[PDB]
C-alpha cells in the first residue's frame, strides 16, 4: 500500500535547482528489465509516467543478483542528494540490550516494503524524474517520477521514521503500558500481559498499522527467539554477543589483528576481563594491511587469557526499572580497567572496559575517576539514571587526593570494596621545606639549532654536576636536571626548579608516563622518604637558579 | 493573542544551529514531557517534522526557593548566530554603584509575543528518550522563547511601557534587562528597597507576568580582593623565593612593582629553611608594593568590542578565586568564593555556584557574561552542571589545566 499519511514538505537547498544528469545508453537486456520493473511499480502507484515538461533527470541502472536471473533497479541519487535539504537525524543512538526492560511477552514486527509504502511530497516528485532509455538513443525514453520515498534518497530514512512516529502516536496514548521500539523498518513490541491479551494487543496494533498502509508479518511469519539483532543474540530473559570465533592462526596480518581487536572490544560488552591493550600495541605504526605482525610474548598471553574467557559462554540479564543499578570497577593492570553493572549481586546487565589516556602523565586515582565518568555517561544513556559505585579505593585515599588536587572532581554515591589491587598514591610531596635536607638548585638548557643540551645542579652543601645531553629539548633538560638531583640526593631532598612544566607534572603525583624519563623520576620519587619541590622565576638575581643557569648554559648558547 | 511580528534575520552566510542533545535522566525527561505537552496545549510550541534540520539542547533545572522543574533551553549557538539582538539593550553604569540590586525573572512575559514565522524553524529542540527506544519528541517555538537574546531585544518596546509609571514614580531606581531577568537597583534602605520591588512586581502582575523576594546583591560591598602579601617576623629563603615569584608575576599586571631589593636577599646557594633578616630597603619596596596591590590597576579598561574572560582556581577548603579580563593579566576584576553551608562535600556543586555568581557580577558591571576557563574535566562538567544550575542563562565555557603557580599568586 501507500500510507494515507499527510506528506512531509520537502525542498531543495536554497540556491539550488533539481538534477539534470543525462541517461547513459543502456543494454537491450537492461532496458527490457527496467521496462517490466517500472511497469509493476507503476501499477502499484509507486511511480508515474511524466510529460516532456519535467526537465529533471537522474541516471537509472539495472543489475541481476546471482544464483537467480532476476533483475534489480538501481537509481543513482548522488546528484539529487547533493541538492536535497539537510534533515534531522533518525536517532542519536541504538538501543543497547542491557537497557531492554524485562517483559513476559515480546514480538518483532518488521514493516515489509517500508520506504515504498510512504508518500513523497507532490511538489518534490518532479525532482525524482528518471528515464528508461530507448534501444540505442532512438527517441525519447519512458519518463517516470516517484510518488513514494525512493530507495537511496537522502530524506527517505528520516521521512519514513517520522511517518511511523506519527502513525504510532494514537496507539501509544491509548496503550501507555506497552513498549514499542522503532528501529529502521523494524518494530519491537513488549508487554507484561499473558500471551492471550498480548497477541490481541499485537493484532490490534497491526490493524492500526495496516489501516495506515503498513504491512507486517502475521503470527506464523513473525521471528522466534533467539533474535539475531545488530550483533546480539536476544533471548526472552537474557542476551549475549553473537557467537564470536577467535581465528586459530599462524602469522597474523594487520587486518587479522584489527578484526581481532574489533571482536574482542565487541565481546567486552558482556564477557568480563577482556584485555586488548597488548594487541593494540602491535597496531602502532602499521603502515600496511596485508603485512604480517609477529606476536609479542605479552600479546600471546593476552590472546590466551581472552580465549579462556570466551570459552565459557556468558549471558546478560535485562533491566528492572524498580531496582538500583550497581557498577563495580577493578584494575586489570597498567592503565587497564574493567567494570560490570548489575542489579542483583553478580547477575550482570552489562560489562565493559576502560583504558584511555595515552600516558599523558597520570595516576590510578585520575584513571579510576575517568572510568567512573565514562560509566556514568553510558548509564544515563542506557537507563536514564546513574549507578551506585563499588570502588577499590579507600574513602581516605579519595578525600586526600580530591581535596588537594587543583581540578574540581566528583564521584557519585560510592562505597569502598576490598578488591585488590587497591588504588593508591605511591608518593607525596612535602608541604614545606625540609630542614636539614640538601637543597638542589637545578636547571637545564638546550640549543634550538643544534638540539644539544646541558642539565645540572648546584647545592647548598656546595656540590655541583653538569651533564651533556644530545637530541634534547628545553623540557627534557629540565626533567633531566630534576632526575639528576634525585639520583645524587638520598632519602630527604629540597629541589628548586625554574620549570613550571616539570613542577606541573610532578605535583600531580603521576605513577605512569609515556616518557621513559618521567618514569625514572617516578621510580626515584617512590624510593625517597621526603621530597619538597619549589619554583622560582628564571633569569632573576635569585641565588642558586642564577648560577646553575651558568654551567648549564655555557657551551649551549 | 498575536501582534505584528518583528522579522528576525540570521547573520549573512550563518545558518541555523545543529547542536546535539545530551542524554538526560528519566526524571528530567518525564519533567520535560509534562512541561512541553502543556506548552503545546497553550500554543507556545508545536511538533515539527524531520524537514527541520535544526536543533538546540534542552535541560531541566530547579531555581532556588523552587521545587518545580523548569525547562532550560541552551540557545548559546542561536544567540551567537543572532544580533539583531542590531537593536540591543543599553547597559547602565549606575547599576554597579547601587546599595542594592534585586534580580527578577521576567521570562514568562515572552510567551505573549508571537515569534516571526520564518524564524521559528531555528528554535527547534528535542526531548530524548531512554535507551533510544522512541525517537525524540521534536518541537519549535511560536512565541518568543526564554533563553534567546532576541526575546528581550524584541520585548524592549513592551517592557518600557510596563515600567514607564514605576520609572516616573522612582526616577532614581535603575532597571536593567538582561535575557530573562530584570536588575533593579536603588540606594534606598533595605526596607524601602524591598517595598519598591514588591510594588514593581504588582506592575508586572498587571501584565500577566507573575514575577516572584528574589536574590539580593550589594554591588557596593564588592571590593576587588588584593593579591595578598604575607606578614611574618622572620623569613626563610623559601618564603622570599615564594614572595619574589608572586611579585615577579604581579609586576606583569601593576607596573609600579619593584623586586630588586628583595632579590638582593636571595644570593648564594642557601638552604630553603635558612632564616634571612630583611634589609630596611626591602622593607620599603615590600610595603610600597602592598600599597600598589590595595588599589585597582592602572591601564586596564573595559573594551565593549572584546569578549570577557573569567578564570577560576580551586583553593581548597571550599575556597575559589577568580579573575575577569579581556587580555591576560589585564584584570578588570578579581574575587573570591567560599562554599555556602551545604556543599561541604561537592566540587562541581561549588564550581557551578561560583560560575553563576561571577556571571551575575559580570552582568551587573558590564551587562555581558564572561567566557569561562573551568578547572574540570569536560565530561564531568557536562554530566553534572545541570544538577545544581539555577540561572535562566548559560555562559560560554572551556576546560583548562590550572597552572600550579597561578593558584599561589591568587591564594589567600
Ligand atoms: C520490548 C522489546 C524487547 N524487550 N526484550 C526484553 C525481553 O524480556 C527483548 C529481548 C527479546 C526485546 O526484543 C527485541 C528484539 C529485537 C530483534 N530482532 C531487537 C530489540 C531491541 N532493542 C529488542
Curated annotation (Swiss-Prot), chain B:
Reported impact of residue 183 to C: Confers resistance to nevirapine
Effect of residue 50 to R: Confers resistance to stavudine
Result of altering residue 101 to A: Confers resistance to nevirapine
Consequence of changing residue 184 to I: Confers resistance to HBY 097
Annotated site residues (Essential for RT p66/p51 heterodimerization) in this chain: 384, 397
Phenotype for residue 65 to E: Confers multi-NRTI resistance
Effect of residue 73 to I: Confers multi-NRTI resistance
Effect of residue 146 to M: Confers multi-NRTI resistance
Effect on the protein of changing residue 66 to N: Confers multi-NRTI resistance
Effect of residue 103 to I: Confers resistance to efavirenz, emivirine, nevirapine and trovirdine
Domain Reverse transcriptase stretches: 42-217
Documented effect of changing residue 42 to A: Confers resistance to lamivudine
Designated name of the protein: p51 RT
Organism in which the protein naturally occurs: Human immunodeficiency virus type 1 group M subtype B (isolate HXB2)
Covered range of the whole protein: 590 to 1016 of 1435
Amino acid at each position: 500500500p501507500i500510507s494515507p499519511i499527510e506528506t512531509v514538505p520537502v525542498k531543495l537547498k536554497p540556491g539550488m535547482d533539481g538534477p539534470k544528469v543525462k541517461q547513459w545508453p543502456l543494454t537491450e537486456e537492461k532496458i527490457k528489465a527496467l521496462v517490466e520493473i517500472c511497469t509493476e511499480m507503476e501499477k502499484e502507484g509507486k511511480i508515474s509516467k511524466i510529460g516532456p515538461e519535467n526537465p529533471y533527470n537522474t541516471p537509472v541502472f539495472a543489475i541481476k543478483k546471482k544464483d537467480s536471473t532476476k533483475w534489480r533497479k538501481l537509481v543513482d541519487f548522488r546528484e539529487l542528494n547533493k541538492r536535497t535539504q539537510d534533515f534531522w537525524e533518525v536517532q542519536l543512538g541504538i538501543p543497547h540490550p542491557a537497557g531492554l526492560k524485562k517483559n513476559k511477552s515480546v514480538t518483532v514486527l518488521d514493516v515489509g516494503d517500508a520506504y515504498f509504502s510512504v508518500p513523497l511530497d507532490e511538489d518534490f516528485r518532479k525532482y525524482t524524474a528518471f528515464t528508461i532509455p530507448s534501444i540505442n538513443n532512438e527517441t525519447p525514453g519512458i519518463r517516470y517520477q516517484y510518488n513514494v520515498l525512493p530507495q537511496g534518497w537522502k530524506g527517505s530514512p528520516a521521512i519514513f521514521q517520522s511517518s511511523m512516529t506519527k502513525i504510532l502516536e494514537p496507539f501509544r496514548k491509548q496503550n501507555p503500558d506497552i513498549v514499542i521500539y522503532q528501529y529502521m523498518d523494524d518494530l519491537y513490541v513488549g508487554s507484561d500481559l499473558e500471551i492471550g491479551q498480548h497477541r490481541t494487543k499485537i493484532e490490534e496494533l497491526r490493524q492500526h498499522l495496516l489501516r495506515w498502509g503498513l504491512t507486517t508479518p502475521d503470527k506464523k511469519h513473525q521471528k522466534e527467539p533467539p533474535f539475531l539483532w545488530m550483533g546480539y543474540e536476544l533471548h526472552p530473559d537474557k542476551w549475549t554477543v553473537q557467537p564470536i570465533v577467535l581465528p586459530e592462526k599462524d602469522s597474523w596480518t594487520v587486518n587479522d589483528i584489527q578484526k581481532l581487536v574489533g571482536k574482542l572490544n565487541w565481546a567486552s560488552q558482556i564477557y568480563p576481563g577482556i584485555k586488548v591493550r597488548q594487541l593494540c600495541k602491535l597496531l602502532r605504526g602499521t603502515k600496511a594491511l596485508t603485512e604480517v605482525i609477529p606476536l609479542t610474548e605479552e600479546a600471546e598471553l593476552e590472546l590466551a587469557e581472552n580465549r579462556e574467557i570466551l570459552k565459557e559462554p556468558v549471558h546478560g540479564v535485562y533491566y528492572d526499572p524498580s531496582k538500583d543499578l550497581i557498577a563495580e570497577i577493578q584494575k586489570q593492570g597498567q592503565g587497564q580497567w574493567t567494570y560490570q553493572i548489575y542489579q542483583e549481586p553478580f547477575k550482570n546487565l552489562k560489562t565493559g572496559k576502560y583504558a584511555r589516556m595515552r600516558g599523558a602523565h597520570t595516576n590510578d586515582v585520575k584513571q579510576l575517576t575517568e572510568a567512573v565518568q565514562k560509566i556514568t555517561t553510558e548509564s544515563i544513556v542506557i537507563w536514564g539514571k546513574t549507578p551506585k559505585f563499588k570502588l577499590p579505593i579507600q574513602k581516605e585515599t579519595w578525600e586526600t587526593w580530591w581535596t588537594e588536587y587543583w581540578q574540581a572532581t566528583w564521584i557519585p554515591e560510592w562505597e569502598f570494596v576490598n578488591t585488590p589491587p587497591l588504588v593508591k598514591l605511591w608518593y607525596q610531596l612535602e608541604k614545606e621545606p625540609i630542614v636539614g635536607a640538601e637543597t638542589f638548585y637545578v636547571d637545564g638548557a638546550a640549543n634550538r639549532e643544534t638540539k644539544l643540551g646541558k642539565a645540572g645542579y648546584v647545592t647548598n652543601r656546595g656540590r655541583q654536576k653538569v651533564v651533556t645531553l644530545t637530541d634534547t629539548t628545553n623540557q627534557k633538560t629540565e626533567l633531566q636536571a630534576i632526575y639528576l638531583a634525585l639520583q645524587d640526593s638520598g632519602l630527604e631532598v629540597n629541589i628548586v626548579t625554574d620549570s613550571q612544566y616539570a613542577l606541573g607534572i610532578i605535583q600531580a603525583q603521576p605513577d605512569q608516563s609515556e616518557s621513559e624519563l618521567v618514569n625514572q623520576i617516578i621510580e626515584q620519587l617512590i624510593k625517597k622518604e621526603k621530597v619538597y619541590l619549589a619554583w622560582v622565576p628564571a633569569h632573576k638575581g635569585i641565588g642558586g637558579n642564577e648560577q646553575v643557569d651558568k654551567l648549564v648554559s655555557a657551551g649551549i648558547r | 493573542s498575536p501582534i505584528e511580528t518583528v522579522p528576525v534575520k540570521l547573520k549573512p552566510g550563518m545558518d541555523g544551529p545543529k547542536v546535539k542533545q545530551w542524554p538526560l535522566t528519566e526524571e528530567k525527561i518525564k519533567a520535560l514531557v509534562e512541561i512541553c505537552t502543556e506548552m503545546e496545549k497553550e500554543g507556545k510550541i508545536s511538533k515539527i517534522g524531520p524537514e527541520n534540520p535544526y536543533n538546540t539542547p534542552v535541560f531541566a533545572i530547579k531555581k532556588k526557593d523552587s521545587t518545580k522543574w523548569r525547562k532550560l533551553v541552551d540557545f548559546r549557538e542561536l544567540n551567537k548566530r543572532t544580533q539583531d539582538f542590531q537593536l540591543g539593550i543599553p547597559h547602565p553604569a549606575g547599576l554597579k554603584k547601587n546599595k542594592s540590586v534585586t534580580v527578577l525573572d521576567v521570562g514568562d512575559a515572552y510567551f505573549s509575543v508571537p515569534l516571526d514565522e520564518d524564524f521559528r524553524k531555528y528554535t527547534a529542540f528535542t526531548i530524548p528518550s531512554i535507551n533510544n527506544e522512541t525517537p525524540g519528541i521534536r518541537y519549535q517555538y511560536n512565541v518568543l522563547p526564554q533563553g534567546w537574546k532576541g526575546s528581550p531585544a524584541i520585548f524592549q518596546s513592551s517592557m518600557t511601557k510596563i515600567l514607564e509609571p514605576f520609572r516616573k514614580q522612582n526616577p532614581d531606581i535603575v532597571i536593567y534587562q538582561y535575557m530573562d531577568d530584570l536588575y533593579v537597583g536603588s540606594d534606598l534602605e533595605i526596607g524601602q528597597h524591598r517595598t519598591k520591588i514588591e510594588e514593581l512586581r504588582q506592575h508586572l502582575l498587571r501584565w500577566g507576568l507573575t514575577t516572584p523576594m528574589g536574590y539580593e546583591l550589594h554591588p557596593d560591598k564588592w571590593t576587588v580582593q588584593p593579591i595578598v602579601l604575607p606578614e611574618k617576623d622572620s623569613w626563610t629563603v623559601n618564603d622570599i623565593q615564594k614572595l619574589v615569584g608572586k611579585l615577579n608575576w604581579a609586576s606583569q599586571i601593576y607596573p609600579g612593582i619593584k623586586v630588586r631589593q628583595l632579590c638582593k636577599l636571595l644570593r648564594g646557594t642557601k638552604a630553603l629553611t635558612e632564616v634571612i633578616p630583611l634589609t630596611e630597603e626591602a622593607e620599603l619596596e615590600l610595603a610600597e608594593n602592598r600599597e600598589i596591590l590595595k588599589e585597582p590597576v592602572h591601564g586596564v579598561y573595559y573594551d565593549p568590542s572584546k569578549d570577557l574572560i573569567a578564570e577560576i582556581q580551586k583553593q581548597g577548603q571550599g575556597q575559589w578565586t577568580y579573575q575577569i579580563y579581556q587580555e591576560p593579566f589585564k584584570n578588570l576584576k578579581t574575587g573570591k568564593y567560599a562554599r555556602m553551608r551545604g556543599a561541604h562535600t561537592n566540587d562541581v556543586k561549588q564550581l557551578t555556584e561560583a560560575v553563576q555568581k561571577i556571571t551575575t557580577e559580570s552582568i551587573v558591571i558590564w551587562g555581558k557574561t564572561p567566557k569561562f576557563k573551568l578547572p574540570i574535566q569536560k565530561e564531568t562538567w557536562e554530566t553534572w552542571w545541570t544538577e545544581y544550575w539555577q540561572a535562566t542563562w548559560i555562559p560560554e565555557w572551556e576546560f583548562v589545566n590550572t597552572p600550579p603557580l597561578v593558584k599561589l599568586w591568587y591564594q589567600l
